[PDB]
Symmetry: C3
Subunit: 428 residues, 3 copies
Amino acid sequence: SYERLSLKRALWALCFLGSLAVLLCVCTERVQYYFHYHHVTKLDEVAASQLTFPAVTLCNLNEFRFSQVSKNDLYHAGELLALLNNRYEIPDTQMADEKQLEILQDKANFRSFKPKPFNMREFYDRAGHDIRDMLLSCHFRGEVCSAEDFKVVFTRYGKCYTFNSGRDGRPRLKTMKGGTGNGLEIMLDIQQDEYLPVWGETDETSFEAGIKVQIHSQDEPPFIDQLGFGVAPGFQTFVACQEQRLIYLPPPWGTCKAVTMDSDLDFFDSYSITACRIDCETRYLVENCNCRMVHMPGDAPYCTPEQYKECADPALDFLVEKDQEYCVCEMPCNLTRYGKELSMVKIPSKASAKYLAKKFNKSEQYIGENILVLDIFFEVLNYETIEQKKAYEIAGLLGDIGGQMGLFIGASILTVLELFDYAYEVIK
Amino acid sequence: ALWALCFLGSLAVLLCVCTERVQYYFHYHHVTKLDEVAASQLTFPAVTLCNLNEFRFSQVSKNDLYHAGELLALLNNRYEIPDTQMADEKQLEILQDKANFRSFKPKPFNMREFYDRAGHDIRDMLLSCHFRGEVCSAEDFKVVFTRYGKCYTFNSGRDGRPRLKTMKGGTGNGLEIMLDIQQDEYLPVWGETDETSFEAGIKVQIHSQDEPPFIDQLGFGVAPGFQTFVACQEQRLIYLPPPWGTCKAVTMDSDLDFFDSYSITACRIDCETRYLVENCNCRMVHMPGDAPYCTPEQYKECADPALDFLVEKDQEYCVCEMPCNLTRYGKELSMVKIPSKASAKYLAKKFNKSEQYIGENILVLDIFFEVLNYETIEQKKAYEIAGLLGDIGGQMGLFIGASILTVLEL
Amino acid sequence: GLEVLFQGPSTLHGLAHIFSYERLSLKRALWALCFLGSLAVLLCVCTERVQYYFHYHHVTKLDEVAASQLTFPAVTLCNLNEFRFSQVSKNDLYHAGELLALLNNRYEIPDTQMADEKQLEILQDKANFRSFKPKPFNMREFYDRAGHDIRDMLLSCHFRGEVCSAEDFKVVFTRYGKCYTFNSGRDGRPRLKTMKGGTGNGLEIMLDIQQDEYLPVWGETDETSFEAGIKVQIHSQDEPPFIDQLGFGVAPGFQTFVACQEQRLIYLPPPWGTCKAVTMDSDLDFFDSYSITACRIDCETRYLVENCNCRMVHMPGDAPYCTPEQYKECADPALDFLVEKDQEYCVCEMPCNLTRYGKELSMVKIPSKASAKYLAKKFNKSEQYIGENILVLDIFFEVLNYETIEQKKAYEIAGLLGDIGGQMGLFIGASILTVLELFDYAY
Ligand SMILES: *[C@@H]1O[C@H](CO)[C@@H](O)[C@H](O)[C@H]1NC(C)=O
Ligand SMILES: *[C@@H]1O[C@H](CO)[C@@H](O)[C@H](O)[C@H]1NC(C)=O
Ligand SMILES: *[C@@H]1O[C@H](CO)[C@@H](O)[C@H](O)[C@H]1NC(C)=O
């Protein structure tokens, strides 16, 4: 009855409770929502008049030219190239090209042979196809290039070449037009006849003739085993690109790493998912095998054919399957990638067939089995942008709670005085 | 007193803004969230593949040619070989003897059996198979009848067996098969008919296991004499039901007579099947159900006309809405020459075929993930009910807050 | 109940007394403190919401809407060889010899002996100018006469299984010369529609690229390429073909499947974006309808006329066709200038409404052994010729489904006012009591 006696104090009392109820709910909802850290994406295109041409890494599918494999190399690495068994003579199986095998007989004869020093990197450098031999003609945006414009990079395919690498303090090339002309355009000889011969199915061996190619930002090392595409001989292969600029959101909204002036990677200048994974592979091999593979950076010693077989390969195989967690290599926030439409036509035309052959002193046959043209260019001089945009920033959370907090405080202040007014009366 | 002027003015404003936010709610606006999320495993997809040649020439018996001669377009409706200006005299000669019905008593015939017997055999075609470096064989392929005939789905997820997973991406770490398309068993063509094409190779569909193959429409071509790399990206799509969108609410029951799991493909096959049974009292070899297989006559005289009627001229019979939850695959095709000169002589010896044969018949198919990374594409509601109610909380904050202020006067 | 006696200790009643003398100033001081605090909040959030409005934020809405019909696109296709060797007359060789690079600027066949003795012998005869009186010459006429004839190239044509002929292909001059757009939508004729997608149910053509009519090549020049095949652009009918830049290559000896997806884009004008608001007024000298392609051709044309008092064969306008001389000495250099050294001259922004096409290229061999013998006899050619010259092109829709890609306004005016309204209306409700004490005291 002291409560009942309220005489419409009690309605005031409950209505303030009703309002404090409402305020808690709305403020909960808007704060629960803030914390899902919702985002949505903004697609756009914006025309440029210049575009920075990408890096173009390209590898022959054949790792080692047959000719350049010395008796010494065969002695150290014979088992690794699977040209020899574990007993360093020529495997039993008889499927082999008797003329080509004859040359391996001679090389693999070790009677009274004194071993010389051997180094995997040197072997790859010497034996790997030479851009100078492969590259029959080169034109960037109609201008002549030669082998001088190709920087050597060791990959898991061996001696490869990045064009417009942006390395060695030379400037990154730019296209001012789209279309078939205004790009890189190269004629390669894949030198099919220097291919390591295959007479037995092995874990190692393949039937491919051609090249793999990666188009990539200069701020990114080539990871061509995984990300590259195939170009076959006997076709001009057009590769129309679209530049794509991605902006992703860090945690808590997303997962990206903020690229800055400090790379945060032992062995590289710029953070990229590729750079990160190579850094990781390299660190881990050094740590667990006290050596690195030819294509890894650092001062460490190159693995010997035995450490390749008995330490490195097993360890890397472990790293991926049974030690996944060891290396989180998350995406950067700022990033540039390239769309690609492959299309092709036959090379050479009948009209041009007889000429090419004469000009390089090769059979017409050879041109059809060995010669390709690669036409990398921009379809359009414009880049697509793909931004993740925060759906609800703090400015908004406060905006929405803010006005309600300001008038609930105002009302609760009024209730403090009616509780002192009630107290005063009771007190007396 | 004066608060009449203010409180009405304010309640005016608040009722307006409250209707704006309700009109907005009812436009049921959405926008999309693209994301990439790195996984360490990925479920490898289903890979259905068909020879472009439906029936091996060898396996086509005199009896088959008698019943289905007009269907294979090897014969006209008079059981005669159409007058050819000039065919391959060698190939023609073998049709002469097959199509000779002197003394011939017709034996029993069944389209399904014909397809099963005559269709290319995976066991003949599949020279070499490797998943993730491991050996596979014909046991890892499941037969599916499609509108191209006897085809094979790899990693089907059917027959109990578990769905395979890639733990790394690249050229190696997926399916890698060497096929012989058996060019020499191709039905011969001496004249132009509706059926006549000039294609040699295979069609391939990469698809979710939760989805039957629709390879006539969705498959892509792979040529012989090339290793064709097919770098995929897994894409997980989430679409919004009505009123925001038109996707079909994903539930436990298929809502299709003949299929376990709802797919745009499953739905269209179900539809085609129901309609043909209803209108033609039979089904085609590749359709499910207990119905009787159509005879070559019903194929020609009932089924083909009915299907062709259904699509253009009877659109409305078949509403096959998209699932909300689903999985698709991006593809980059690229290719290199097969075999290399170095490897040419070996392949030939190893399969007892000419080097010639290898160049016209042998292909390699390399399906894999470019990166172990799935892209997500969600339609996300722009204004949920939780929010509209949140904002009319604005109205209750004045309503309660105004009445409390009125209690001070009285 | 001692608490009732003396009515609470003196200490307390005295407190209660201070309260009551002070109350009227607490009430005022608190409302001053609170009303200011609230008006502070209101001014801030109302600023924030207006700053945000003016960044004119947008975000994008992807959807896939099914349909039962789709308008089939335009398909422009060009032979990669610009001029058939046969149709090159003595007169043409005289005027344009240098342009086709069959002659140097000295009216001789470059000293080179690298060439086919048989094919060279026919150039000797043509390029003999002894006693020769030149006739009149016109680049457009030369292209029209010498360009490959669709009627010769097109061995078989089927739209959705129905037969088509050369009559169904409209001629367009491009920078590759005499080319052909199928389902152009020009000349009144209606735009074709597929009612179902898949390998059959679209355009399916067999071409002979006529390899043996290719201009012969013995010496490296800018024009010299070794390509044999065709380039193809799939494009909306509302858009001229820009096939040098946007086309893709199709090789002979393969059936090339080209599975398309229709894509409808809606982009936002300024201030949100940069697109050109659709008007039926083209605002383009030479075209009916705005496209980025139409705009760039218009520009190229205006600029060349302006700088070179002539146009190239493929450009519109009434201007005179450039002579082989003006092509070499004026036009090519000027266009090259326009792009590199005069970038800013030519502002060709994207339209807001438009339609694009996704493409998956895939291929199989042609012809099958079974069909090899037939094709050869049916066209009176070696089996050799079929493998080097014959291609099939299969353009179709993968599914009857268009994808929509809309930029949508993130914060429209309805919202800005709604929110500034809600805050202004919420502050009024709270500060009601302070309004009266501001008028009471004022009184
Ligand atoms: C980094 O991203 C921001 C995004 O606003 C941009 O201003 C800048 O040019 C980018 N720079 C890079 C990739 O280093
Ligand atoms: C789709 O199905 C999967 C099966 O595990 C489920 O986890 C998922 O929540 C569904 N996707 C969405 C976002 O509804
Ligand atoms: C063009 O105008 C508007 C939107 O910009 C819309 O109705 C539709 O997307 C377009 N309509 C056409 C091309 O008929």
